Each structure stands twice: as structure tokens, then as C-alpha cells.
């Protein structure tokens, strides 16, 4: 059996669930309650491989066995983008590790209501190496690409 | 620090 | 003879644009929790027309021209424009409604929302863009005047 | 002011949106929901002129149509006539401007030769380019060449 | 021989973090933004011996109007702060230095451009501090003294 | 350092601020409230030098109209009243400074309009009747906009040495 | 492609100022020599696309996988120049190897207030074959060249 | 082995 235990950290109103429930349940969640978090799961033919994404759409207020976290900001925000360090160092603090597999994705890139240029949304991601993508659950853009690229980051870390 | 507003 | 609406968030200068073009002085502060249906005739653009405006704060059916406005010293407001873009298209159930996105309060040196954002966004509907500041009466009238051109257009 | 109202027709799986959004929003859409369609738009310095492309990325379920097939398909290439005659049927005209383009030519897993992707395009006179939104090949030239076709039909 | 300085700014920028790092020497992990003492310390300021009796306000010779490079609200609150300081002193030339605090963070949006043309829109110096590093922490207050010296002479 | 404290005097409707806010804030002021006047400023790479233009659109005010190191006395080229208020704001400037030799530059603003009556002749013989330079600006164009302010610095520099 | 470098030295030489002028791009007026993060940055190194995950040590996982050490002294010091063996042998002590890629750089050559001539800063470096450069974070002189040249030293050692 | 002065 092949599995992965993933987590989805971020602020409220960015799209943490919109990604979890567009990749898994397959439809744009018009709105999902940000004050609940179930440990969603789904099997997908990930990269020439058969893996089981036991995700966790966390909201604070598990995160030890977090194999790959999905630290996510909004491109039509900035408060959510400045919380990266406070969600970054959280993930390092618990795992007490400066090298934990992750991917900072830029969600809701479907809006022309956007401020966070891909520059900031790279130099920061380049400032931990870890990959960057630009999702939008209204479109299913890098939605799956965001989660899939986390798996590789998990595969790497071990070997 | 929950609130609605 | 035009019915205009001024949509926007609190703290952008929604009222400052409606009471400097009409009543002619910088409103030191207007209680946003209120909204009259303000009006004023002006010799608009080689023509004689009546600006029955509306400074909404959350007509919305005969709004011939919506003055969708953000603050260039904000960002939450500039991000809310979709939340306000879709509002106007939602009611009018139309993807083609005359409007003009203006950047209010360009007089302040604490500006972050550059003119680029204040264009490629406005370029993503074609609809014009200007940069007002009721402390100055800059494009204040230009914003309302250019909206009229957009109303005339849509009809013909 | 100068404008053009374009429409992008085709089957699902060719990349109708990948051309609308790589020309306009500038980045390879790794995946776009094939059940949505906005009337996108963008101003560009088209061909020594300042023109506004108010496109439409249709999926079912107009001045110039972007009837498009996939070069690594065959079903999509064989729906042209039905996407063809659809365009003629609505405008009730046999002379409507458009341009048949072959999308996703960046792939080596291809079967639809440039021959077919010409003799067919030569069987309406209308151009033909080969786009691929992963590269931005004829992406713009597909849309740009449509504008000329619109300008023509008028004068 | 001294100087009496003030530190204005919003909540969450690091007003006190500067004010206690340069005086009491350590990154105050978190200082309750609801209190304000009139801190002070003697330092061999710049080829001279002066006493920086400061005051990190939270709601007078040289104010320290401070915004956070990882903020935006605090950055946009500076006129409500740069007029406030002008409003009290009923003067349109009061020595100040706009510094950009907490530049240690990669989670930053306020580019150095903003954090210059704004400072250049009063001439007053600009530095970028981060009380977790003691970068221009002293430089910010040190440079303020230079601004005080000027205005007199 | 290298600073310069400048003042922009003129009538209402010429574009006193339009020159102050096009050179500094870089965009054509469609209309600026003539009832206000701030002490604007800007650093520019003036003339092989690094100088600070703390300007003042007039429409501290003692502190400026007293150390106005160079006054930008400005008329409109599509006017005549403003061009006749020449002798009223230049006697004004030489009254306060109690000096018949104050560095200044008379510019002809808004020369973008075809509706112009004040030929360059008037807009020279007069400027020739104080020696002080003349240029022809238009803020919608950024013509001699900076040229007017830059040439004033030359007049400040000279007056000293 | 990626390298995990280290920067050893004394207090007051410039250890971080090099790490935070090559990476974050500005002269750090003062960086506390009492804190050490594992900084990083991707650059177009030498016709190549490589990741400099550096570490500004100030006396695990790194001080072992230290692929290349930036043993650095100050040209306006003297004790720091004399400290490099306690830093020279330290690096060889852990790695238990007499051949570890390193580059002795001379920092803060911007000062005319200098005593340690280039001779010293060569015959010493010639007593390990490892390259020498002269940096100054107030200028960004050999700042990138010191790090870049270390990469050549890593590439060599393996092959 | 640290302290200040
Ligand atoms: N109803 C509503 N939806 C919003 C609001 N702000 C954002 N959204 C949408 O909610 C969607 C997903 O909600 P989400 O952010 O995942 O919930 P959370 O991540 O737990 O906070 C996003 O795609 C947004 O477009 C709002 O104020 N009201
Ligand atoms: N400087 C300053 N301005 C204030 C203060 N309080 C209110 N204002 C002004 O109040 C206005 C907000 O009201 P207004 O914009 O007219 O209402 P709206 O049209 O509904 O958005 C802003 O333009 C501010 O300039 C204050 O304490 N200081
Ligand atoms: N997640 C996912 N994305 C896909 C798949 N197949 C194609 N895509 C993406 O969808 C894009 C094509 O959009 P397109 O099919 O041309 O739009 P449509 O023809 O109108 O439906 C491609 O560029 C792919 O990136 C798939 O099986 N799974
Ligand atoms: N103890 C603690 N400190 C934090 C936390 N989050 C941020 N900080 C630090 O605490 C500082 C905030 O305090 P400060 O800004 O000086 O208060 P203010 O200047 O009066 O607004 C910031 O510089 C952060 O680096 C937290 O959760 N706990
Ligand atoms: N046609 C027309 N133009 C006007 C009117 N009011 C102002 N203007 C124009 O607005 C500009 C105002 O320039 P401004 O800098 O505000 O004048 P200042 O305050 O004296 O410096 C002038 O160039 C005029 O051409 C008006 O009622 N009609
Ligand atoms: N003016 C002044 N500068 C100092 C002082 N201490 C350190 N510096 C500056 O900071 C640098 C030394 O600290 P630093 O080298 O960054 O610590 P390290 O890199 O961890 O060894 C030198 O380049 C000095 O220019 C001091 O007491 N006064
Ligand atoms: Mg969620
Ligand atoms: Mg209101
Ligand atoms: Mg589609
Ligand atoms: Mg405090
Ligand atoms: Mg004026
Ligand atoms: Mg250090």
C-alpha cells in the first residue's frame, strides 16, 4: 500500500478548503465553513504511482505526522501572505526541523483582483527552495499540481 | 479570539 | 438626466467624491452609515445633464452608471472590487454595464496600489480609469463625467 | 476606441482555454475547468493599432471565431465541420471570418499532419497556425490573424 | 547633555522592540503595546556624549515614525502619523526619520521603493531595522540625533 | 547638503500647482484646489549635482516668502490678466526681500494650447526687462516643466558667488 | 542542483554580512553574531543553476554535510587571522579529513585601517592550496566570488 | 564565554 498524510495550513478566507474539496470532491466549493476541519482522503493515480492523499484541511484555534504541509496564502490578499513566516516557523517549530517537505502555493489566481505579484510569490518560495504554484479552485488550475508536487517533496526528503 | 466581526 | 451609483468600501472616500463634485468642499468626515440620493446639474461635456447620484454603503437596478471606486492608500478595498464588480453584474444580470474604476485619494504619499494594478484591472474590462482625491478636486468631476460617456455608449 | 468580439469554439480536451488565458493572463494553465466560460478581455498593441480583444472561451452546454482542433487528437479534428457549420448556421452566412488553428503542437505524440491541417484550412481559404500554450507559439498570432480577417470582411 | 525622542507607530510594527533592544539590549519577544514608559540610556552617540530619553508611544525633539516592512496598514497609517506629529508641533519642519522595521522577515511586501520615495517625500532619512538582529536599530535613533542637530543650526 | 527652497507665485487658473505637481508627482493635474498650498519637495539629479527642491505653490509661509531662494513667477500664455499681474507679483517679491536682485525665472505656462494671445515677444522683452530667464511650459506635456525649476537653481547658485 | 555551505569565523569579522549581502542584498549595519539561521538563495552560479543553502555558524546536520566551508578572517583584525587553525583544524577535526573544500577569504578589505597584508592572506592560504579572495560587504567585492569559488572547490573534490 | 564587556 502507498499513502501520504498531508496538511493544509493557512488563514481563513484564502481557500484552504477550496483546494482540499476541489481536488478531492471535484467542484468549486462556493463556501465551506472555515471553523471545521476533517481529515479528508482520496486515492489518485499520482505520478505513475498509486498513492492515497489523507489530507487535513486545518484551521488552528496530525501536525506531527504532517508529511507534507500545504502552506497556502492568497494572491488577492496580503495579510495572508505576511502570515507565511508565522505558518512557516510553526511547521518547523513542531517538527523541530529546518527541512520539512512543503510547497507554498498562491491560491485564487483566477481573480484580476490581485496584488501579490509572482515575484514576491517566488523570492519567498525561493527563500526556502520549496516549489511554488498558482491555484484557483474556481478553475482547478494547479490545484492538483499543488498537491502532486508535495508528494515529490516527500519522496525526496527520505531518500 | 474567535468572533464574527 | 442620469442615475448614477457610487459603490465602494468604508474608508475609501465614497462620500468625499459625491459631496465635493456636488457641494464643493472637502468633507472632513462623512458618516458612511448613511446615504442620500444626491443630485446636481452640470453643463456636462457639451450637454445639459442631471447627476442624480447615490453614495451607497451596503437605483440598484436603474443604476445607469456605477462609480466603482477603490482607495490607492488601501488594498482590502482594491481587492474587494470583484466582490463589487460581480455585485453590479449580478443585479443587472449583465456582463456589460457602463462603469469606471477610479483610484480615489491619490493626493496621499502613502500609496501602495500602483497605477499598474489601477490599470490592468481597469484594462480587464475596458472601462476607463482615473485618479481622484477630494482634497484637490482632481479627476473628481472627470470620474463622474467620463461615466456619462459610458452610458451614452452602451445605448447607441 | 477600437475593439473586437472573438469566440473560441472547439471540443473539450483540445485547450480552448489554454489559448484564451495564455494570450491574456500569461501563464500555462496547468488545468482549466472545461465547464466554465467567461467573456475574457484584454487590450493589446495589435498590428500597428490599439484594439481590445473581448474574447469568449465557449464550451457549449461574434465577429471572428477561433475554431480550434487538437493536433494530438482526432475526434476534435473531425468535429471541425460540425463546429464549422455551427458557425455558418448562426451567422446564416457562408462568408464569416475565422481561423482554424492546430493547438498543442508542442507535443511529439501527434498524428494530425500539417497536410490535413491545411487542405482542410485551404478548403475555406482561411489561414492556419500551430499554437501550444505551454510555449506561447502562434498563440497570439492565432488571435492576431483573426483581427485581419475581421478588418477584411468589412471593407 | 541629552535628546528627548519619541517612537510613534501602529500596533504590531515593533515600536517597543526597537525601544528596548537599543536601551536594554535584547529582542523583547513580545511587549504589551498598551503600556509606554519614557525609556532612556546614555550612549557615546557619534563622537559626542548624549542621553536618549525616549518614549515609545502607543496612544519632544525627534520622533521615530516607524512602519513595518511586512505590514501595509502600518505603512499606510503614516500620514495619520506624519500629520499628527506636524499637527502637535504646528510646524511643517520637525526632525524625524521614517524607518522600516523588521526587515529580518522574508514575508515582506513593502519594497524599498515605497520605503524611500515616501521618505524622500519629506527628505527625512530612511533605514531598515529589525530588533531581532540589531540592524539599523541604533542607526535609526543615532540618525535622529543628526536630524535634531541640523534643525537648530 | 545641497538644498533649494523655491516658491511658485502666480495668479489663479495659470497652473501654478500643475508645474509643482507634474515635476514632482508626475501626472497632469486635471484640476487642483487653488485654495490650498502645501510645501512640496523632491530630490532630483539636478544638473551634475544632487539637490533638494522644497517647493511652495503659493495661492512657515513667512519662513518661505522670506528665504524664497528662487521664486517661480509664472503667467499663462492663454491669459492676459495673469500676464498683467506680472508687475504685481514681481514688485511683491522685491518688496518682501527688499532686494532689486532676487533670483527668479518667468515661465510661460500652458503653451500646449492653440488658443494663445501672449506671443513669445511679450514673453521675452518682459523677461528681458529683468534679465531673468524665460521658458514655455505645459504640464500636460512636461515641456520646460523641469527646465523652469532647473534653470532657477542656476540663478540661485550664481547670486551667491 | 544544490549546495549546503557554512561560514565559520570569529565575532566582529563579517560572517553574516557576507551571507546577508550576497543573499539579501544590502550592507547589514550590524547583525548579532549570537544568532545563526540556515540561510539560502538560488543564483545563476557559473553557467549553472544551483542552490546555496548556507549557514552562518557562530560557535548538527550541517557541520558534517558542510560540503564547503567559508573560513573567513578580517583584514583589519589580527586575532581573527590567528584563529583560523582553531577553525582550520576544527573543520578537518570533524570531517576527519585533511582534504575538505574550503576557501579562506579576507573580509572587509574596504577599510584603509588594515594591517594584514595580502602576503599573509596568501602564504597562509597557500599552505592549504585552497583559494583566497578579498571581500567587503559594504562594497560587494569578492562577496559573490568567495561563495562562487567555493562551489568549484566542491565540484572538484568529488570528481 | 559570551556576555558583553
Ligand atoms: N461567502 C464568502 N466566501 C468567501 C469570502 N472570502 C473568500 N471566499 C471564498 O471562499 C472560498 C474557499 O473558502 P476557504 O478560504 O477555503 O475557507 P477557509 O480556507 O477554511 O478559510 C475561496 O475560494 C473564496 O473565493 C467571503 O467573505 N464570503
Ligand atoms: N486626517 C484625518 N482624516 C479623517 C479623520 N477622521 C475622518 N477623516 C476623513 O474622513 C473621510 C471618510 O469619510 P468619507 O470618505 O467621506 O465617507 P464615504 O464616502 O462613505 O467613504 C476620509 O476622507 C478621511 O479623510 C482623522 O481623524 N484624521
Ligand atoms: N488535472 C487534469 N488536468 C488536465 C487533464 N487533461 C488536460 N488537463 C489540462 O487542461 C488543459 C486544456 O484545457 P482545454 O481542454 O484545452 O479546454 P477545453 O478544450 O475547452 O476543455 C491542458 O493544458 C491540461 O493542462 C487531466 O486528465 N487532468
Ligand atoms: N512572544 C511572541 N512574540 C511574537 C509573536 N508573534 C510575533 N512576535 C514578535 O513580537 C513583536 C511584536 O511586539 P511589538 O511590535 O514590539 O509591540 P508594539 O511595537 O507595541 O506594537 C514582533 O516584532 C514579533 O517579532 C508571538 O506569537 N509571541
Ligand atoms: N475650461 C475650463 N477650464 C478650467 C476651469 N477651471 C479651471 N480650469 C483649468 O484648470 C487649470 C487649473 O490650474 P491650477 O494649477 O489649479 O491653477 P492655480 O491654482 O492658480 O495654480 C487651468 O489651467 C484651467 O485651464 C473652467 O471652469 N473651465
Ligand atoms: N560602529 C560599530 N560597528 C560595529 C560594532 N560591532 C560591530 N560592528 C559592525 O558589524 C560588523 C561586525 O559584526 P559581524 O561581523 O556582523 O558579526 P559576525 O558576522 O557574526 O562575525 C563589522 O563589520 C562592523 O562594521 C560596534 O560596536 N560599533
Ligand atoms: Mg478552508
Ligand atoms: Mg458614505
Ligand atoms: Mg475548456
Ligand atoms: Mg509598545
Ligand atoms: Mg496652485
Ligand atoms: Mg553573525
Curated annotation (Swiss-Prot), chain F:
Its EC number is 3.6.5.2. The modification N-acetylthreonine is found at residue 2. The gene is KRAS. Pfam families: Ras. This is GTPase KRas. Changing residue 13 to D: In GASC, JMML and OES; also found in a breast carcinoma cell line; somatic mutation. GTP binds at residues 10-18, 29-35, 109-112. Changing residue 40 to A: Decreased interaction with MAPKAP1/SIN1. The modification N-acetylmethionine is found at residue 1. Belongs to the small GTPase superfamily. Ras family. It comes from Homo sapiens.
